[PDB]
Ligand binder design. Structure first.
Ligand SMILES: CC(C)(COP(=O)(O)OP(=O)(O)OC[C@H]1O[C@@H](n2cnc3c(N)ncnc32)[C@H](O)[C@@H]1OP(=O)(O)O)[C@@H](O)C(=O)NCCC(=O)NCCSC(=O)CCCC(=O)O
Ligand SMILES: CC(C)(COP(=O)(O)OP(=O)(O)OC[C@H]1O[C@@H](n2cnc3c(N)ncnc32)[C@H](O)[C@@H]1OP(=O)(O)O)[C@@H](O)C(=O)NCCC(=O)NCCSC(=O)CCCC(=O)O
Ligand SMILES: CC(C)(COP(=O)(O)OP(=O)(O)OC[C@H]1O[C@@H](n2cnc3c(N)ncnc32)[C@H](O)[C@@H]1OP(=O)(O)O)[C@@H](O)C(=O)NCCC(=O)NCCSC(=O)CCCC(=O)O
Lengths: 566, 566, 558
């Protein structure tokens, strides 16, 4: 019961059954994966109040609230270890990511009430903007599980002011609303000032019976003593915390609904989520959802931690996409890249990925050359330009699989227009106006990181994820030390020492964990977890898209076919 | 020769001649202004190569290139002291701001070739985004005077990766182009990799004859020696720097034009600027341009450095806007704010500004009260909501003059809807979809900083400026130390000591210079320089606006009139 | 001083010098062209008040006002003979088209004050919407030379009410303003009610000193008493200068005479944003290398004769240069880049004649030029999509008899590929011009950048050799009456009617095509359109970031 099975079903299948496993490699990847999981667990547990203590006082933690909201097994966290300003607890005081609620994907943001009652900490504003941007680009509902005490007083200068500070999300929520994207808030505990605007900015307000939202909270030694007198007098005065339920439900009616406990609040949210517009994804399917035909655990063997080793990218694609099917656009032209159509739970996506290894008699603009997989040449850049443009016309979201060492350099490459072709790709992406996912398989480096659907496209890239085998740098430490200090040897030992410093630093500052802490990549995900994220993304993309191309009116399949025959 | 003189000419005049000058105050302001000018001069001079040395080698500095481009006296720098990451030289290696070129306003970005040949330094990416955002919001041409050596190798992790890093401007330039906003580049010196994409991303490329743009640049002790052999062999090889004029002019034709020297490049830019679409501002005028009727130097007396002193805001408005004329919207309603129409070189703007001092028998929702000027109440918030909405419909840009201590707090204020009214203002602003300017007169604090056209509105606020009398904090240090440590005295000397630490820190981290270094405000401007910036902004706003309301079809003047009569 | 001469300069040249002229054909074309010119002249002269009488009373006619405004030789009229409701005078009481004012292209609408003082007549509302749509799609300034007495009382039911009636332009002017497109009005004579809203809706109002704009203007024996009492009362016509200048200030400026009003308009036009077209040029403007008058020989009036489309393209575009996209693939169509006064346009045009061993989905087949097959439709889909990305406007040259029919064609996806083209055009979001060379027929007329794309096609023009029908009269009579002597008679009626109702003049009267233009006048219209398109475009693609030239090159080499 689908359109055009001749084009969209029984596509060529790709990938081989894994002949030689590699335990050493698998163990190396899993060591990175373990450290990530361990750091996340330690960070989620950190803070002045435990989950156990929270539960005793009648409150749920962020993860408890999240797990009560979502369909089991659908949680795709992002920015778990994001901590650009290096807070001691290791987080930005929010837990965020994608989750599914009774079949509907939503973007979830949860205050960490274990840590200073969910206070604004350095790096949080940035994290929050990455949330609302994702919702914006995907037209996906934004859900706040809110428990926010506002500005951290010692850090006010880092959390209160500026273009992208604590005030920005309030504008971003109005923008979402104006773009037709609903925002739903569960209001827990005390939310004064900063937390008050997080409470009031959403579309729908569901309150805990003890919760509040307010413009402002309650209310030498001779100086020092005076304060404790006023405090204990006000405490015996028993004035209620401003903007409690008797105010914001009974008087202003800004609280739409009030629930007795945390799980009641969740039920309220679930109810309003059920009201939200969403396609039955069947509408956009070209085939019934099918698992890949090769197991994802093979990826622990296929993707080498030895950064000097090539591998076959088709083996990766075969394990990530429905039924191991792939419909390649212009195979043979631009051999440094794979571009083609694939399926994700029956839904069309365009896949763009680096080819690794030696490229015989290539590029064409060089007399007698061998090309390096992971680099970009003329035909690859042109093929991508076309494929992006075609997918954009067809309203087909793009998933980029990056493992790249840059664009070809030198005057032969220059004459081949590579600088202009790279920028043309940037222009093509910006022109596409569709949500896109970027997945760093191993190397994200040079300008290729930018042009290959990089997170530098703030209008199209929703977020980025990386595997345990990934690394981010401008160029390898060795090449960098070279270009920096080679001319300073044309003059001149103190220089040798700081070349080895640079090499060491580039290794340190390019490790997967460091990369996600700085937010270079949003999440480090397990090899068995990459497809889940692709599924989350793709289903979110097609849940309520702002534009449609009927299948019979799509150009990509037609142009792909013609190139194969003509 | 203007529409509706009955509405737009002979408006009420405001302001008094200054009776009592205040030398002490004037001197205090000018001390802040001097320190700013002095820090800017020191920062512009800093770097491994002087202007004198640059000139000897046949090159102009950033400021020389800028001064050769612009009409004399039209330079409005922004982010002069922006240095969020605290680079030693004190800058982000770019000089940026507004400048006029033969009557046309343009946004200007100039590489600082005194410092590591214009290398990407920490904080630069952010600075560059503030540039392209301004051009985007105002539909104003972006001009690059480019001399960029790319990534600073030691700092690569801070300048190369991430959503808002060195790659982002290349996407932002494509966005500008796609929105119909031209980008023009003068290409000087060597521009490899990162600087190559700054070269190629603009609409128009004008090159210095010795300049280049490229995807990549040229080309233990036994290890160490090997490098200097290859280097000196390549140096004697005399291979030209990749992507020089014989390549990018003669072969690729990406350089549109080539000039012999720096001033030739400027002439080329001037020529292409002359091609750009721009209104004769006469088209949008409602009166002939007229100076204010009171001198701006009085502002050194009027605006008190004593943060506890009120002043009359009308005295400020009278000195900033054409002919000291003001057409107030709903005077008497919402007395804590002034909202009304003014003129800037004959062009209509909407002005929103705090009233200072005691407000008798106010707010209305309190039994017997005296209101504090600089705070926001019910009627003020509602009046602003309406005025913003009206100006938005009329396509009249808004200028916000902030001097504020926040929104009224407590359950009487809550019942009066202040939390929802504040957010309604945010929604109203976001809905306006027009470029806006924010000017901090003194206090930018609390949520009022956000709602009063704050820079937290990334779609509407083009940039923000502040006077020498300005200060930024969440709340005063004393109130902050209180709310932080008062409950920790209900338990318990080590606490007293860190309360005085907080008070001191809030004073340090809220000084005008510190605020602009962090980018809380984009520029600290002289009292005599505020009108110039307002003129730059307003004329840029009306140069090529994307939407028009004919004067006879404007609602703001009509509604303003009806309230006065009915 | 241009980007990428390697791509944009010294493109292949096309066309041959004309070997054998054809006087018979030329004369046949010029006979149609003469009849058009003659009908236009008669229509412009028609009406109860002559130009001579207007001049005596101190007033200029529509054409005098237009000719005083525009740079000489830049007038591109549209809808000259548009008269869908068949008014006796032959017009819709407005003169409209493209004109250039001191180098700036603008859209011009002028009230015909020769005819019932510029009253609203049947068909006018539709004509006015075609004006504001053009301005909308090109972001081009709209100029009204206004002299409008409002609703024609006898015809009120046809000019006053409905979604697309006399009130619609007032909403369309607000839309233009909100899209940032300025509207400038010169207010002449009396403009009450309907004409009052034409006066007030624009951005800028310039008034003649005797002019007015108003909400409303100023048994049997009883009426003439009140009338003569009011006439002796000497009450001024409502909303005159002492009101709308002195009191309301809705008139921005007042001039003593018609030419003063024009000067005021010129001044405000000079204020308007416009590129120096040099900014978007890839070469200096160059005439074609073959004369346009050859087209009188090249394009056959004998509708059964093929001709070489390249000969047409060679005579319309700068320096006879053409950079063809995917030559050899989809031979029934020509798609490629060309230049118009140095500016890039994408050209899509039918190939005529026999196509050997084609289409590929059939066995031993000969293809018919002017028809659309699989590869043509796919090539156009790609080329449209590529030009859209590159912000390159499209010019469509139509001479077509439809899309291939039958189950082999169906299996080849032709129905879906045709609609994909429609989708592709709608997706392009750029102003486009459509020129009917000869045949506009079947679904091909729709998909080949037809005027049915109300968001992209600015207007359409046709040559004297053009004709519009669903299908030929013979084929139509067949399909209608084959399944059915009284029947033979009404088959010949149908054939005759299809010939009658498909003549160039009839087509433009009904608005099927907006203007019938002379063979020597096609390039001028292309120049007007292209220069208007690039005057103030809403989106740019830098030359070095364009995909079309790159993809075109790769197909040639790879
Ligand atoms: C640019 C020139 C030719 C200029 O040399 P010059 O004429 O001597 O000029 P000068 O005023 O004496 O300044 C040179 C001096 O300024 C400093 N400097 C220059 N560039 C950098 C940098 N990128 N990072 C850190 N420091 C830099 C160094 O101390 C230079 O000394 P040196 O030239 O080494 O003797 C040269 O210094 C050079 O080649 N520099 C940088 C090497 C390079 O190729 N860098 C590209 C950086 S990687 C990148 O941006 C990648 C982005 C993503 C991608 O596309 O891959
Ligand atoms: C929120 C509550 C009621 C929660 O108290 P609780 O029930 O004891 O909860 P708990 O788990 O024991 O946590 C309290 C403890 O967590 C820490 N903490 C809490 N909030 C902050 C903060 N904002 N900055 C820095 N540290 C904070 C403190 O150590 C708290 O201890 P304390 O309550 O003082 O004994 C209370 O701690 C409180 O009132 N906190 C903050 C005071 C306040 O009113 N803050 C508003 C911050 S200003 C702002 O955000 C302005 C934005 C712009 C504007 O609108 O003006
Ligand atoms: C406009 C002038 C002042 C023209 O001055 P003039 O020197 O007489 O000019 P002329 O060359 O001699 O032309 C007059 C002659 O042209 C014809 N004519 C003029 N206006 C109309 C019309 N509206 N419908 C049908 N026929 C009209 C009539 O035969 C006129 O003869 P008449 O003036 O009756 O002796 C005058 O004819 C006049 O006052 N006409 C009546 C105009 C009028 O009442 N217009 C309102 C039309 S209703 C409407 O548009 C409402 C729309 C909805 C709304 O906004 O309410």
């Amino acid at each position: 019961m689908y359109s055009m099975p001749g084009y969209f079903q029984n596509m060529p299948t790709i990938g081989k059954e894994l002949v030689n496993p590699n335990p050493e490699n698998e163990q190396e990847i899993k060591a990175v994966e373990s450290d990530i999981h361990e750091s996340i667990k330690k960070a989620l547990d950190a803070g002045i109040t435990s989950e156990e203590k929270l539960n005793e006082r009648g409150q749920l933690s962020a993860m408890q609230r999240i797990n009560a909201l979502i369909d089991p097994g659908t949680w795709c966290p992002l920015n778990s270890l994001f901590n650009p300003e290096n807070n001691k607890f290791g987080t930005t005081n929010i837990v965020n990511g994608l989750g599914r609620v009774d079949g509907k994907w939503v973007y979830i943001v949860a205050s960490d009430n274990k840590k200073m009652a969910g206070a604004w900490v350095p790096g949080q504003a940035e994290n929050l903007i990455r949330c609302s941007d994702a919702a914006k680009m995907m037209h996906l509902p934004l859900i706040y599980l809110l428990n926010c005490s506002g500005v951290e007083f010692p850090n006010q200068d880092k959390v209160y002011p500026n273009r992208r500070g604590g005030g920005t999300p309030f504008f971003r929520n109005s923008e979402l609303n104006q773009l037709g994207i609903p925002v739903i808030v569960g209001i827990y505990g005390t939310n004064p000032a900063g937390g008050g605007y997080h409470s009031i900015s959403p579309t729908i307000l569901i309150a805990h019976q003890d919760a509040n939202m307010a413009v402002g909270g309650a209310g030498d030694d001779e100086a020092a003593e005076q304060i404790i007198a006023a405090q204990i007098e006000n405490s015996k005065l028993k004035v209620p915390a401003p903007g409690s339920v008797p105010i914001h439900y009974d008087e202003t009616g800004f609280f739409r609904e009030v629930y007795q406990n945390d799980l009641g609040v969740i039920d309220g949210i679930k109810k309003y989520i059920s009201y939200l517009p969403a396609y039955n994804l069947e509408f956009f399917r070209v085939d019934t959802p099918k698992a890949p035909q090769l197991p994802a655990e093979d990826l622990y063997s296929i993707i080498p931690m030895n950064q000097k080793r090539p591998y076959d990218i088709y083996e990766v694609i075969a394990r990530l996409f429905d039924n191991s099917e792939f419909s390649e656009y212009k195979k043979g032209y631009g051999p440094e890249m794979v571009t083609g159509l694939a399926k994700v739970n029956g839904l069309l996506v365009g896949v763009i990925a680096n080819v690794q290894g030696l490229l015989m008699n290539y590029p064409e603009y060089k007399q007698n050359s061998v090309g390096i997989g992971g680099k970009l040449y003329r035909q690859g850049l042109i093929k991508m330009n076309e494929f992006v443009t075609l997918c954009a016309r067809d309203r087909i979201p793009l998933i980029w699989l990056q493992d790249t060492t840059g664009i070809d350099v030198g005057d032969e490459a220059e004459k081949a227009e590579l600088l202009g072709l790279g920028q043309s790709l940037i222009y093509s992406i910006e022109n596409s106006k569709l949500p896109s996912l970027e997945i760093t398989i191993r190397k994200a480096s040079a300008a290729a990181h930018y042009v290959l659907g990089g997170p530098q496209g703030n209008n199209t890239n929703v977020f980025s994820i990386g595997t345990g085998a990934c690394e981010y740098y401008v160029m390898p430490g060795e090449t960098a030390a070279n270009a920096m200090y080679s001319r300073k040897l044309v003059k001149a030992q103190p220089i040798i020492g700081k070349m080895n410093d640079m090499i060491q630093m580039y290794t340190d500052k390019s490790r997967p964990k460091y990369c996600t802490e700085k937010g270079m990549v949003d999440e480090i995900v397990d090899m068995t977890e990459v497809r889940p994220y692709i599924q989350a993304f793709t289903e979110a993309a097609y849940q309520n898209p702002q534009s449609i191309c009927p299948m019979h009116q799509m150009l990509t399949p037609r142009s792909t076919r013609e190139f194969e025959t003509f």
